[PDB]
Structure 1
Amino acid sequence: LDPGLQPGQFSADEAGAQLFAQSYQSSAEQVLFQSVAASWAHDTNITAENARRQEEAALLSQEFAEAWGQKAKELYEPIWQQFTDPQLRRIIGAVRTLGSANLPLAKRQQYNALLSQMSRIYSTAKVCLTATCWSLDPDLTNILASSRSYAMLLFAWEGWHNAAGIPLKPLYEDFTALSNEAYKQDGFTDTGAYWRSWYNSPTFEDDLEHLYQQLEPLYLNLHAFVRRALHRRYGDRYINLRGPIPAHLLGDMWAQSWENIYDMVVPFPDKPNLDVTSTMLQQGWQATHMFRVAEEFFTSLELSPMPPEFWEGSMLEKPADGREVVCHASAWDFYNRKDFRIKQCTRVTMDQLSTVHHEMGHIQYYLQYKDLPVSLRRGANPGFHEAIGDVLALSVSTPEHLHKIGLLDRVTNDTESDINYLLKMALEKIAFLPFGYLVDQWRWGVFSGRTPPSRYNFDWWYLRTKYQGICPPVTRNETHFDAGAKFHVPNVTPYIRYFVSFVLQFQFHEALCKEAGYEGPLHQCDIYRSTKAGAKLRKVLRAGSSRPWQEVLKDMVGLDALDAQPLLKYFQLVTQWLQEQNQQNGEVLGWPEYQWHPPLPDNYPE
Structure 2
Amino acid sequence: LDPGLQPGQFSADEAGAQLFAQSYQSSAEQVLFQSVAASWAHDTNITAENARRQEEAALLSQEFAEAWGQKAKELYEPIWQQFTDPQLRRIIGAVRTLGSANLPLAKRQQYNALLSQMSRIYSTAKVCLTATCWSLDPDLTNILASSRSYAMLLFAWEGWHNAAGIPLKPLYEDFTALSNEAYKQDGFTDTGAYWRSWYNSPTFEDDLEHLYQQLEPLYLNLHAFVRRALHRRYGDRYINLRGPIPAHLLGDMWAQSWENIYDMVVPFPDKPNLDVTSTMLQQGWQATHMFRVAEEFFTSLELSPMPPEFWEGSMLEKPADGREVVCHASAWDFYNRKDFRIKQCTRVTMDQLSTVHHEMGHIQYYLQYKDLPVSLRRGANPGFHEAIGDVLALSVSTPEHLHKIGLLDRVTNDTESDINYLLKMALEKIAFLPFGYLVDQWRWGVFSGRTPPSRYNFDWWYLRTKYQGICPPVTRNETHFDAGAKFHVPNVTPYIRYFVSFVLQFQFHEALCKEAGYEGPLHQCDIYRSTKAGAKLRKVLRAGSSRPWQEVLKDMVGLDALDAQPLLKYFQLVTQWLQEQNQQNGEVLGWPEYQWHPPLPDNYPEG
Per-residue CA shift, 1:88-107, capped at 9, x if unaligned? 22211111110000000000
CA drift of 1:87 comes to 2.1
Query: How far apart in 2 are the matches of 1:90 and 1:272?
Result: 52
Query: How far apart in 2 are the matches of 1:292 and 1:577?
Result: 37
CA drift of 1:250 comes to 0.1
The answer to whether residue 180 in structure 2 is matched with residue 147 in structure 1 is: no
CA drift of 1:77 comes to 1.9
Query: How far apart in 2 are the matches of 1:155 and 1:451?
Result: 29
- Percent of counterpart pairs with the same letter? 100
CA drift of 1:209 comes to 0.5
Query: How far apart in 1 are the matches of 2:410 and 2:544?
Result: 41
Q: Is the 8 A contact 1:94 1:375 kept in 2?
A: no
Query: How far apart in 2 are the matches of 1:333 and 1:40?
Result: 10
Query: What is the aligned residue count?
Result: 606
Per-residue CA shift, 1:34-68, capped at 9, x if unaligned? 00000000000000000000000000000000000
Per-residue CA shift, 1:119-138, capped at 9, x if unaligned? 00000000000201000000
Query: How far apart in 2 are the matches of 1:366 and 1:90?
Result: 20
Q: Is the 8 A contact 2:376 2:544 kept in 1?
A: yes
CA drift of 1:292 comes to 0.7
CA drift of 1:335 comes to 0.7
Per-residue CA shift, 1:548-596, capped at 9, x if unaligned? 1111110110001000000000000000000010000000000000000
Per-residue CA shift, 1:346-402, capped at 9, x if unaligned? 000000000000000000111111111111111111000100000000000000000
Query: How far apart in 1 are the matches of 2:292 and 2:221?
Result: 37
Query: How far apart in 2 are the matches of 1:305 and 1:85?
Result: 35
CA drift of 1:13 comes to 2.2
Q: Is the 8 A contact 2:288 2:316 kept in 1?
A: yes
Q: Is the 8 A contact 2:294 2:357 kept in 1?
A: yes
Shifted more, 363-372 versus 479-488: the winner is 363-372
Query: How far apart in 2 are the matches of 1:376 and 1:90?
Result: 10
CA drift of 1:605 comes to 0.7
Q: Is the 8 A contact 2:37 2:334 kept in 1?
A: yes
CA drift of 1:82 comes to 3.0
User: TM-score normalised to the size of structure 2?
Assistant: 0.99
Following TM superposition, the consecutive aligned residue runs of length 4 or more in structure 1 with deviations greater than 6 angstroms are none
Query: How far apart in 1 are the matches of 2:602 and 2:486?
Result: 29
Secondary structure at 1:328 match in 2:
coil
Query: How far apart in 2 are the matches of 1:207 and 1:71?
Result: 36
Q: Is the 8 A contact 2:334 2:340 kept in 1?
A: yes
Query: How far apart in 1 are the matches of 2:33 and 2:537?
Result: 27
CA drift of 1:212 comes to 0.4
Q: Name the counterpart of 1:259.
A: 259
Secondary structure at 2:134 match in 1:
strand
Per-residue CA shift, 1:487-540, capped at 9, x if unaligned? 000000100000000000000000000011000000000011111111111111
Superposed CA RMSD: 0.7
Q: Is the 8 A contact 2:515 2:532 kept in 1?
A: yes
CA drift of 1:15 comes to 2.5
CA drift of 1:4 comes to 0.5
Query: How far apart in 1 are the matches of 2:484 and 2:544?
Result: 31
Query: How far apart in 1 are the matches of 2:86 and 2:603?
Result: 66
CA drift of 1:19 comes to 2.0
Query: How far apart in 2 are the matches of 1:547 and 1:136?
Result: 40
Secondary structure at 1:563 match in 2:
coil
Q: Name the counterpart of 2:163.
A: 163
CA drift of 1:410 comes to 2.5
Per-residue CA shift, 1:301-355, capped at 9, x if unaligned? 1111111110000000000101000000000011111100000000000000000
Q: Is the 8 A contact 1:90 1:546 kept in 2?
A: no
CA drift of 1:194 comes to 0.4
Query: How far apart in 2 are the matches of 1:92 and 1:530?
Result: 39
Which runs of no fewer than 5 residues in structure 1 stay unpaired? none
Question: 1:65-144 residue pairs with structure 2 within 5 A?
Answer: 65-144=65-144
Query: How far apart in 2 are the matches of 1:288 and 1:54?
Result: 29
Query: How far apart in 2 are the matches of 1:426 and 1:229?
Result: 15
Secondary structure at 2:342 match in 1:
strand
Query: How far apart in 2 are the matches of 1:104 and 1:65?
Result: 13
Q: Is the 8 A contact 2:400 2:410 kept in 1?
A: no
Query: How far apart in 2 are the matches of 1:293 and 1:92?
Result: 42
Query: How far apart in 2 are the matches of 1:365 and 1:93?
Result: 24
Query: How far apart in 2 are the matches of 1:24 and 1:301?
Result: 35
Query: How far apart in 2 are the matches of 1:222 and 1:351?
Result: 19
Query: How far apart in 2 are the matches of 1:400 and 1:370?
Result: 34
CA drift of 1:17 comes to 1.9
Q: Is the 8 A contact 2:222 2:578 kept in 1?
A: yes
CA drift of 1:76 comes to 1.8
Which runs of no fewer than 5 residues in structure 2 stay unpaired? none
Query: How far apart in 2 are the matches of 1:241 and 1:411?
Result: 34
Secondary structure at 1:127 match in 2:
strand
Shifted more, 335-344 versus 74-83: the winner is 74-83
